[PDB]
């Protein structure tokens, strides 16, 4: 910003006027706009090189919103940490960014990339016989790590429970840790020979997701985000099949435990002998050299009351050094005690699989050091137009409450207010009319209702089945 | 509504004043171009013959299919009094105005013109660097002072007085500020040609005692002048008129010779795009425009977030729409601006959806919407939110001694269209404050 005359409308932009820079004649081809201050990126999806930069931009910049025409991306420190992991240096990013940016990358943006792109690749955390060693390839790091007030070729031990603390300390300190597993050269851990049967098919978007995880050849620890129904189950199966080691799957449900195992049996060639399900019904553990455990976070996160039947399983899980862990619906792992399973269970690689990577509290960002950075994210619209997922005509129906009910609405307290407007007569008419209209069309209708009392009232009058927590499996 | 507006103003002028108006060939030539094509055809035939033609003959020229156009043409010509219908010898003879006929004859045949088109000093100036810049900036300044955006050089009192008293840019001393109105947004929407006439037409009504014909005379010949040329100096009223013309950026003077500008020529009905913006589901606006005027008008109902040299990016928000609605801008107008300033890409994708829609079922052909329907629904819904409460001022009537009296009073109010609401059970009815006196007057009677 030097020698630029403000415009008469510059007042409307409160320090957001980024016209101080100039535009090159090649603006017609370059598809990237960059905000010199906020780091925002505006991408043209109707210009040449759109597909050229659609993958490069996603790796470096997380998506804030990707509507039909104009895609919006933002560069953040966490996003860069994910990008620098997969063989990316500042020079490559700067060269490509200038080659694609309509507006020059400002010094502030240049400064931001330099700081966060140089720290990666100087500290590694390894696991040996259930003993965690913070190994460093250079001796200079000992004067920085061993002298840290929190902690406690050179390798030193660290408490398993302290992992949740040191990893945060690693983020706070200049050097963050990376979890890379060299399964090719790992022979101590027994292998599991399983490969996808010929009937299996690998979709391109899944193939891209796997490539982002196996880019350098060493299994990474991170999160894979794909839209609901994209086939995350096969992504986990492929990851388990390629690693060929001891594996485990954690899901926050009982019915889903059977679903994952059912998909596992049909897609891969694992024999039933090596698969054990650890749920409230059966708790037997495989005695073969290696196998799979498809359990739930509730069983592994419990600490206080474990019975003899489950205690033996816990010792079996803890005693052996596992190689892989799959966290289906990983958007609930950073909870108060669900996160304890990550530390308690020893594994050289961790995979997260959640369709939605958001939650009400600000603990979503904690997933970076619990399981790793974000590897790949798939756009919902792109898969929808490719025939991989269905299209939805989302609608919001406005149902004005009747006068009589609304009279009590004003007086009634908030706690009972919910129950008051949940069973308004107008909504009953809309739900009944919509259900009948779609039933005539021949549509399979699912009605969701968080309020159990409202759910029962709807079903009892309408004479339709209802399912809620108290019902058995 | 350009030819309609100019033509309609001429009709209201008394015939006595119109005859004097047709004295100069220049104004007659300009008025000639305003009539419908059929009217011009008849006029050209009648200008060069000093004779009388019966009415029926001109009807014979028009074919049966084009019979309807004949009615409109003759009506338009008669209203302006250009055509004088004379009836004699049992036949309705038709003749042309002697002043108009002579005026047109001189212009076409190059007769004595009394310097109606002006003179040439042979001292030209660069049009692109000076004429275009001066008028563009001067017209730019007035527009900015109208849209409300801050600007250093405020317009002079002359144009300022015209804007206030007119429907444009309503102002209140108590508020101490100027804001746009419903007509003001339409004025911005209208193209430059109609934008200029609205100010000029309002000025023509503003002038008092300055002759109406003289101001009309000056305006018409101004378009006849060609940009990038000198024109030496005219009526006494035209002198002060010429100086006032500079306020609107139509004529440039160094401090004896006046130069017409692009706007001056454009006045006489002369025959990616800048301003195009992307409207999408996320309520994000990406206007590929680089100009303060376009930015200022967008900010009326768009919450701007940042600006680049090539474009300006912003977001539609509930606050932004309500701000425009409060001033008086209607939602239908807003969508019109969005639709008429659409990006070419939006049309193609919308057409692609239409093509697929036709492919699946070609029996339905709905009007295509360039921008997603969700934005339209939300914007209109917000308008409904502002119109949530409807209130009328007036009085209430009750305690009628006889039911017949109540019916009689209520019936009369309905007859004069001042009855708002009524209830037979309560024998009560509410009337607007405007018609309160009328209902009370009937009650006494």
């Amino acid at each position: 910003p030097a020698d630029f005359v403000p415009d008469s409308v510059s007042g409307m932009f409160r320090s957001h006027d980024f016209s101080y820079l100039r535009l090159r004649p090649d603006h017609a081809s370059r598809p990237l706009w960059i905000s010199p201050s906020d780091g925002r990126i505006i991408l043209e999806s109707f210009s040449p090189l759109a597909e050229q930069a659609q993958d490069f931009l996603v790796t470096i910049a997380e998506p804030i919103s990707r509507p039909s025409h104009i895609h919006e991306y933002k560069i953040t420190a966490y996003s860069l940490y994910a990008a620098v992991s997969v063989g990316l240096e500042t020079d490559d990013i700067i060269s490509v960014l200038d080659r694609l940016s309509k507006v020059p990358v400002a010094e502030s943006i240049i400064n931001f990339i330099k700081g966060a792109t140089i720290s990666y690749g100087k500290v590694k955390l390894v696991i040996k016989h259930n003993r965690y060693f913070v190994e460093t390839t250079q001796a200079d790091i000992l004067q920085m790590l061993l002298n840290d007030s929190v902690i406690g070729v050179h390798s030193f031990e660290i408490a398993n429970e302290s992992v949740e603390v040191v990893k945060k300390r690693c983020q706070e300190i200049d050097y963050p840790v990376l979890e890379e597993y060299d399964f090719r050269n790992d022979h101590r851990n027994p292998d599991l020979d399983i490969d996808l049967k010929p009937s299996t098919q690998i979709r391109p978007y899944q193939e891209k997701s796997l490539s982002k995880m196996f880019g350098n050849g060493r299994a990474r620890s991170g999160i894979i985000v794909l839209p609901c129904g994209a086939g995350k189950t096969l992504v986990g199966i492929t990851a388990a099949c390629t690693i060929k080691k001891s594996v485990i799957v954690l899901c926050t449900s009982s019915v889903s435990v059977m679903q994952w195992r059912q998909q596992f049996l049909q897609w891969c060639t694992l024999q039933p002998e090596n698969c054990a399900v650890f749920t409230s019904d059966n708790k037997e553990m495989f005695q073969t050299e290696s196998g799979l455990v498809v359990s739930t976070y509730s069983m592994v996160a419990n600490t206080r009351n474990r019975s003899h039947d489950s205690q033996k399983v816990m010792d079996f899980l803890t005693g052996r050094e596992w190689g892989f862990i799959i966290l289906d619906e990983v958007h609930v792992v950073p909870a108060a005690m669900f996160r304890r399973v990550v530390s308690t269970i020893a594994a050289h690689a961790k995979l997260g699989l959640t369709a939605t990577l958001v939650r009400e509290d600000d603990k979503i960002g904690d997933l970076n050091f619990l399981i790793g950075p974000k590897l790949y994210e798939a756009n919902w619209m792109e898969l929808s137009q490719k025939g991989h997922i269905a299209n939805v005509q989302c609608a919001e129906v406005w149902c004005p409450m009747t006068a009589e009910f609304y009279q009590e609405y004003l007086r009634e307290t908030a706690r009972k207010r919910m129950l008051l407007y949940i069973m308004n007569p107008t909504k009953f008419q809309a739900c009944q009319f919509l259900i009948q209209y779609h039933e005539r069309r021949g549509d399979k209708i699912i009605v969701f209702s968080d309020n159990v009392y409202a759910l029962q009232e709807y079903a009892l009058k309408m004479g339709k089945p209802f399912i809620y927590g108290s019902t058995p499996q | 509504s350009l030819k309609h507006s100019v033509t309609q103003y001429l009709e209201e002028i008394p015939q006595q004043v119109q005859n004097r108006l047709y004295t100069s060939p220049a104004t007659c030539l300009a008025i000639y171009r305003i009539l419908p094509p059929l009217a011009k055809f008849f006029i050209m035939a009648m200008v060069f013959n000093e004779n009388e033609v019966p009415l029926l003959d001109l009807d014979k020229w028009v074919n049966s299919n084009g019979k309807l156009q004949f009615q409109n043409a003759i009506k338009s010509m008669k209203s302006l009094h250009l055509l004088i219908p004379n009836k004699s010898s049992g036949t309705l003879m038709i003749n042309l105005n002697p002043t108009f006929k002579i005026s047109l004859r001189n212009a076409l045949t190059g007769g004595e013109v009394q310097n109606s088109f002006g003179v040439v000093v042979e001292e030209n100036v660069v049009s692109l660097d000076l004429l275009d810049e001066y008028s563009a900036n001067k017209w730019e300044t007035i527009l900015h002072f109208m849209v409300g955006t801050p600007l250093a050089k405020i317009p002079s009192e002359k144009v300022l007085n015209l804007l206030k008293h007119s429907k444009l840019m309503e102002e209140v001393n108590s508020t101490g500020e100027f804001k746009i109105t419903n007509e003001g947004f339409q004025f911005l929407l209208q193209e430059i040609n109609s934008q200029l006439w609205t100010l000029l037409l309002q000025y023509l009504k503003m002038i008092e005692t300055m002759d109406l014909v003289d101001v009309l005379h000056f305006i018409f010949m101004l378009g006849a002048l060609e940009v990038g040329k000198a024109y030496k100096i005219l009526s006494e009223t035209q002198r002060i008129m010429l100086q006032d013309m500079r306020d609107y950026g139509l004529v440039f003077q160094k401090h004896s010779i006046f130069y017409p500008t692009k706007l001056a020529l454009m006045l006489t009905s002369d025959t990616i795009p800048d301003g195009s913006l992307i409207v999408e589901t996320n309520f994000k606006i990406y206007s590929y425009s680089n100009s303060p005027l376009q930015i200022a008008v967008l900010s009326l109902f768009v919450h701007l977030k940042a600006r680049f040299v090539n474009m300006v990016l912003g977001q539609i928000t509930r606050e932004s729409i309500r701000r425009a609605l409060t001033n008086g801008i209607t939602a239908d107008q807003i969508i019109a601006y969005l639709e008429t300033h659409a990006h070419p890409q939006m049309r193609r994708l919308a057409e692609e959806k239409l093509e697929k829609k036709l492919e699946l079922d070609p029996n339905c052909k709905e009007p295509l919407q360039v921008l997603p329907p969700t934005v339209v629904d939300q914007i209109r819904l917000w308008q409904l939110e502002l119109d949530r409460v409807i209130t009328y001022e007036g009085s209430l009537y009750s305690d009628f001694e006889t039911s017949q009296e109540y019916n009689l009073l209520s019936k009369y109010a309905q007859d004069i269209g001042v009855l708002l609401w009524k209830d037979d059970k309560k024998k009560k009815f509410f009337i607007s404050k405007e018609g309160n006196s009328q209902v009370l007057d009937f009650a006494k009677r």
């Binding site: 129906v397 149902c399 009747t402 007569p425 107008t426 008419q429 809309a430 | 329907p373 629904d377 819904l381």
Partner: peptide
């Protein structure tokens, strides 16, 4: 787009 129509119910 149904915004100008009446309400639903009864």
């Amino acid at each position: 787009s149904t915004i100008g129509k009446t309400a639903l119910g009864r």
